[PDB]
DNA sequence: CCCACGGCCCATCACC
DNA sequence: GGTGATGGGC
DNA sequence: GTGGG
């Protein structure tokens, strides 16, 4: 599909997601709208009514009455109104400042931090994520060309061998299936020495070279297994590049190639492989692949020691990372 | 009618 | 000060 | 908001 054909109808969901997500705090509703508006995105014809979209998964009565009025008018009288409407559109806005969350860009609108500038000009009211992502807010919704992620790889892979070569570093998400452009980078990290029966400082070492070589830029967040920062690769006299968003875990050895399945995805296809796990009476999620006995109970995990290894527990051909879109 | 809709790390708050 | 809750992100 | 038990 393409957009024009369904956009309207998609971009309506997706707005009134937002909203969900951001104002009203209702999690559940945010999804919902999304998973009708993917659904509607890969519908292959022309929606002409809110009766043939009730027809997929995931649309319902609501989104069906809300399509014919889109249909009939152009519009929806409901997300004209809350558009215009200056508190709910600053809530909504400042959530896309990367450690503002609803409850956040609620309480600054309550106390008139409605713009960007608003939060420029009120420094001390943010915490040291929200202050980052303050000052890289443009850099960070920009998308990375696979070319850029590519050199960005070339350096986290460089620097992960050159503090200890028995270091294992993989660029996971949608990157590794070959994605023409990337949203961040997600770098899962192992050694031989961390297993789930086993240093403290295995994630430290890799970090703090990334910026010795001045590629990390900024921290988010950072513990013994998870890492939240930022990186920019150098200039070249030409222009600087986007600072970028990336995230480094580090996983025990034993649970490493579970790890790498689960964060490259895709989502469906995630939900697709657990769901003929089940079938064959394995149980997977991010860490493991469990035998379930007659009755449901689960046994120890299973040795891993590659994603293909997962692939024969259930019964399934080797799917190349590239093949993974569901 | 009623409940699920992912779960967990890290930073920081709420309270003792 | 310590412990658990909450917010945020993925 | 939707689906399913
Ligand atoms: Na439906
Ligand atoms: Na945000």
Redesign the pocket.
């Known amino acids: 599909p393409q957009e024009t054909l369904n956009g309207g109808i998609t971009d309506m969901l997706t707005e009134?997601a937002n909203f969900?997500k951001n104002v009203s705090?209702?999690?559940?509703?945010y999804?919902?709208?999304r998973?009708?508006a993917s659904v509607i995105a890969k519908y292959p014809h022309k929606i002409k009514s809110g009766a043939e979209a009730?027809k997929?998964?995931?649309?319902?009565?609501?989104?069906?009455?809300?399509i014919d009025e889109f249909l009939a008018t152009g519009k929806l009288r409901k997300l004209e109104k809350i558009r215009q409407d200056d508190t709910s559109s600053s809530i909504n806005f400042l959530?896309?400042?990367?450690?503002?969350?609803?409850?956040?860009?609620?309480?600054f609108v309550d106390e008139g931090i409605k713009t960007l500038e608003d939060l420029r000009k009120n420094e001390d009211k943010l915490?040291?994520?929200?202050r980052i992502?303050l000052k890289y807010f443009g850099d960070?919704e920009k998308r990375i060309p696979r070319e850029e992620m590519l050199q960005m790889q070339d350096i986290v892979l460089n620097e992960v061998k050159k503090v200890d070569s028995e270091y294992i570093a993989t660029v996971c998400?949608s990157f590794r299936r070959g994605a023409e452009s990337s949203?961040?980078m997600?770098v899962l990290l192992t050694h031989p020495s961390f297993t789930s029966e086993s240093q403290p400082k295995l994630?430290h070492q890799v970090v703090e070279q990334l910026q010795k070589v001045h590629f990390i830029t900024d921290?988010?967040?950072?513990?013994?297994?998870?890492?939240?920062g930022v990186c920019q690769l150098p200039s070249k006299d030409e222009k600087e590049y986007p600072h970028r968003?990336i995230?480094i875990?580090?996983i025990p050895k034993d649970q490493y190639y579970c790890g790498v399945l689960?964060?490259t995805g895709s989502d469906i296809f995630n939900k697709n492989m657990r769901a003929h796990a089940l079938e064959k009476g394995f149980t997977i999620?991010?860490?493991t692949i469990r035998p379930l006995g007659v009755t449901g109970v689960a046994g120890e995990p299973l040795p891993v020691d590659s994603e293909k290894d997962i692939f024969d527990y259930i019964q399934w051909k080797y799917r190349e990372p590239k093949d993974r879109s569901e």
């Open positions: 009134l969900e705090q209702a999690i559940h509703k999804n919902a709208y998973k009708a009730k997929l998964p995931g649309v319902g009565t609501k989104i069906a009455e809300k959530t896309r400042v990367s450690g503002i969350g609803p409850s956040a860009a609620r309480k915490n040291h994520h929200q992502g960070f998400g949203g961040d997600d994630l921290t988010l967040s950072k513990g013994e297994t998870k890492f939240m968003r995230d875990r580090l689960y964060f999620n991010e860490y």
